[PDB]
């Protein structure tokens, strides 16, 4: 009941999965439905880069050279080294935690465009998640599109693989941990439900229309087993807007769902 009401007032739909992947206890509402990933997925970008890593040496440290006509509006770290270049691991850093939008495309490319992000995914063993376009134009959320979308189930199983499972290497699978830790843009999200002393790593999306909004997490306990949890909104109306407290109001119900 809680989650109907919340999404009632928000005037929208909230999607939520949160697994205990200790006790496995799972808090879930929509978790099936398709929900526009928006700058989520370059978190599941700079996996797949980490996974090529493991057959490519120095592939991290390889320097990306890129032009003004790279750049794409909100690129608030790569701008500032286009007249100089930056590395692959920088790159990715960047995408996630700024969510830097010329570094996601720049990966994109070196990884075969969104198919090649779609492969990797279906290479961990997820059936949901598709990537079909690239920065800007898969932000646009259309109802029923299901393109650029996944469901919170897929992303919080596929989160779980990459952070804690073994789809990754573990000198990658630390990488991964530790950009989404490093995230800058999640402060107001999962993060402000999240208690103060335990460890968390994020990566958000917003898209800009349909009240179109999100985050995935996994957080740290102390204590107890880690939490992974994915809170995706979207609205019916494309001037609709999205809403931080919503995600952050729901991150909070999961976890109390599961006894935080
Ligand atoms: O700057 C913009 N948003 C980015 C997108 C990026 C993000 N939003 N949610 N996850 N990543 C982010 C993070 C923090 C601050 C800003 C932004 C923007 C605003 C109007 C229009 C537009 F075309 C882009």
């Not at 590395?87 to 700024?98: C, D, I």
């Given at each position: 009941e809680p989650f109907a009401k919340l999404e009632q007032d928000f005037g929208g739909s909230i999607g939520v999965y949160a697994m205990?992947?200790?006790?496995?206890?799972?808090?879930?509402?929509?978790?099936?439905?398709?929900?526009?990933?928006?700058?989520?997925?370059?978190?599941?970008?700079?996996?797949?880069?980490?996974?090529?890593s493991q057959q490519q040496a120095g592939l991290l440290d390889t320097p990306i050279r890129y032009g003004k006509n790279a750049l794409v509006p909100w690129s608030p770290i790569s701008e500032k080294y286009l007249t100089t270049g930056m590395?692959?691991?920088?790159?990715?850093?960047?995408?996630?935690?700024?969510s830097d939008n010329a570094a996601?495309?720049?990966?994109?490319?070196?990884?075969?465009?969104?198919?090649?992000?779609?492969?990797?995914?279906?290479?961990?063993?997820?059936?949901?998640?598709?990537?079909?376009?690239?920065?800007?134009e898969l932000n646009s959320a259309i109802p029923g599109?299901?393109?650029?979308?996944?469901?919170?189930?897929?992303?919080?199983?596929?989160?779980?693989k990459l952070t804690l499972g073994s789809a990754l290497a573990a000198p990658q699978r630390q990488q991964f941990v530790d950009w989404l830790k490093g995230n800058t843009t999640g402060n107001h999200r999962?993060?402000?439900a999240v208690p103060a002393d335990w460890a968390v790593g994020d990566k958000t999306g917003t898209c800009g229309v349909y009240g179109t909004a999100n985050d995935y997490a996994v957080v740290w306990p102390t204590g107890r087993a880690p939490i992974v949890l994915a809170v995706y909104t979207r609205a019916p109306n494309k001037?609709?807007?999205?809403?931080?407290?919503?995600?952050?109001?729901?991150?909070?119900l999961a976890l109390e769902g599961l006894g935080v």
């Open positions: 205990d992947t200790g006790s496995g206890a799972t808090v879930s509402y929509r978790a099936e439905e398709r929900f526009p990933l928006c700058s989520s997925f370059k978190g599941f970008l700079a996996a797949a880069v980490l996974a090529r590395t692959v691991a920088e790159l990715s850093a960047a995408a996630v935690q700024y996601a495309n720049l990966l994109l490319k070196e990884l075969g465009g969104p198919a090649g992000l779609t492969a990797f995914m279906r290479s961990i063993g997820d059936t949901t998640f598709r990537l079909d376009r690239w920065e800007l599109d299901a393109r650029d979308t996944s469901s919170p189930r897929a992303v919080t199983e596929s989160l779980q999962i993060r402000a001037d609709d807007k999205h809403s931080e407290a919503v995600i952050a109001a729901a991150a909070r």
